[PDB]
Structure 1
Amino acid sequence: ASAYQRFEPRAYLRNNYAPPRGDLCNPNGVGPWKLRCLAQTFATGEVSGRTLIDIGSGPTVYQLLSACSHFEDITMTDFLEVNRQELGRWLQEEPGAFNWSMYSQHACLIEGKGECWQDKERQLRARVKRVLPIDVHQPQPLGAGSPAPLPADALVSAFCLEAVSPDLASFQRALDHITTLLRPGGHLLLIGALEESWYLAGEARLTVVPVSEEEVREALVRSGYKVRDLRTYIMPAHLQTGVDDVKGVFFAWAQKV
């Protein structure tokens, strides 16, 4: 976890959200697939409410695109200052912010409601009230008196848990921890890597717990969830780039019962 102190956001983003992986043009790529999972899931309109929290946002927003048109109060979080600062930059349209425009576009394309992407971003920025520090290893991961209206009506988290946890049980506790933030009857949309064990981000070389679809399911159940959907994307050769050793990406829609 002290490895995360050398974590370089610009190199993360570059490694994982710029082309090839960041070229949204081929619909068989991983970005289109993630974006579509979120989109489909919300267009069901069974995931709805007033507040929502992004767990381990790091320096990224795509995970909230389709989401943001359904929850008026959206809280973002990450363990690192540097990331909370990089999010700041895009939220406030400051100089040198990252360019998500491609992602916004495709969310708009995928949702098919004829929305322009500036309207979409405009809505996201507007609905993101706060960026908060977070440690999922803590049993109240946000702290005590957090500005975050609890309990949240829903949780979103991508590539965090399995990437902050040294092992399967550790991963499992973290899940219990965040689940604490989620109002009962509420919804969790979880996206992560499958059987990934390391991934780079500049100088920082991070270790990952290689989980599996079955492990992830059991884990969601153990933590008190009803699994409404679990889907798997197998990484194609040409998206294997040596910034990691990820084999697939998984997406899960789970309802706390």
Structure 2
Amino acid sequence: PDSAPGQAAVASAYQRFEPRAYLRNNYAPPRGDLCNPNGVGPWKLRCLAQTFATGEVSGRTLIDIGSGPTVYQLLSACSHFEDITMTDFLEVNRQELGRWLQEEPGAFNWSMYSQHACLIEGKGECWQDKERQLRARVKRVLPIDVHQPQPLGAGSPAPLPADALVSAFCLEAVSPDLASFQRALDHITTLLRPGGHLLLIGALEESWYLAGEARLTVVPVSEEEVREALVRSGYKVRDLRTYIMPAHLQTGVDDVKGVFFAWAQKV
């Protein structure tokens, strides 16, 4: 079956994606409340911090796939990669990132996430040094379409192949069917060198989430399907953890049942 139709549907829906609302729905309290150790924020940050602390994920270059208007996914990573490439389909998201990069006041304040990262990394790093390091190591913010055989376009900047990939809430939020998800994964995988690592975070059993006016339709995937897709793309799953969304965190911004975190290494 042709993908174009579904892809065109996805592309269209995102043209109504709103950064501001997106950030508030998912990265402001209650979801953006890092105080409760059992919330989703802390758990995500713990997964990333702990994986990097094994020292097994290192290199020079890293590419964040579908960054959106967020940087939390790179807080623990920036102390291990000198060259970081951020990416997103939407220009308005790339501007939102540019806004934070310029330390402008009208930008989202990630300090809460930064402090927590420094907190669990346990190196007595103050969050300001942490944010400073990230801003310095983000070498580029590029456009991307995971549905293309070459997601970054052709002859794009991004040093290739990247030593590591990081991607949160992208693949499953932009793929019509499960076959698309698998294809999307194979496409970004061509950006990672053999032996490289992939840090993937995502929503489990989700069909919709809100980005302001947007009521984006998402393909629900399970742990089993993610694991299966990772192996089908040539990865050895090194770690796959699941977080069950608590009742108090089901604010009505989406219908997500859980969140997965996968650490896979390209074979």
TM-score by length of 1: 0.99
Shift of 1:123: 0.3
Deviation at 1:145, TM superposition (A): 1.4
1:177-228 Cα distance to aligned partner (Å, 9 max, x none): 0000000000000000000110011111111110000000000000010000
User: Aligned to 1:40, which of 50, 62, 85?
Assistant: 50
Find the counterpart in structure 2 of residue 223 from structure 1.
Answer: 233
Cα displacement (A) at 1:117: 0.1
Aligned counterpart in structure 2 of residue 146 of structure 1, from 152, 156, 163 = 156
Displacement of 1:109: 0.4
Following the alignment from structure 2 to structure 1, what is the Cα–Cα distance between the partners of residues 254 and 215?
10
Q: What is the CA–CA distance in structure 2 between the aligned matches of 1:5 and 1:26, rounded to whole Å?
A: 34
2:35 to 2, 7, 25: 25
Q: Give secondary structure in 2 for the equivalent of 1:126.
A: helix
Deviations for 1:141-176, whole angstroms, at most 9, x for unmatched residues? 001111110000000000000000001000000000
| Structure 1: 5+ residue stretches without partners | none
How far apart are the structure 2 equivalents of 1:55 and 1:199? 19
Q: How far does residue 52 in structure 1 lie from its aligned partner after superposition?
A: 0.2
In structure 2, C-alpha distance between the alignment counterparts of 1:195 and 1:224, rounded to whole Å? 24
CA-CA distance at 1:95 after TM superposition: 2.8
Segments of 5+ residues of structure 2 without an aligned counterpart are 1-10
Counterpart of 2:260 in 1: which secondary structure? strand
Counterparts of 2:223 and 2:105 in 1: how far apart (Å)?
40
Please state whether the residue corresponding to 1:31 is helix, strand or coil. Answer: helix
* Shift of residue 94, structure 1, vs aligned partner: 1.7
TM-score normalized with structure 2 length: 0.96
Deviations 1:55-105 (A, max 9, x none): 000000000000000000000000000000000000110230100000000
What is the distance in 2 between the residues matched to 1:229 and 1:132? 29
Q: Which runs of 4+ in 1 moved over 6 A?
A: none
CA distance in 2 between partners of 1:175 and 1:52 (Å): 16
- CA offsets per residue over residues 8-52 of structure 1, 9 Å max, x none? 000000000000001110010000000000000000000000000
- Residues 227-247 of structure 1 deviation map (CA, whole Å, 9 limit, x = unaligned): 000000000000001110000
**Alpha-carbon distance in structure 2 between the residues aligned to 1:25 and 1:53:** 29
Identity %: 100
Q: 2:263 is paired with a residue of what secondary structure?
A: strand
Residues matched between the structures, number: 257
Q: RMSD of aligned C-alpha atoms?
A: 0.4
Shift of 1:127: 0.3
In 2: Cα distance, 1:171 partner to 1:241 partner = 26
Matched, 1:51 2:61: yes
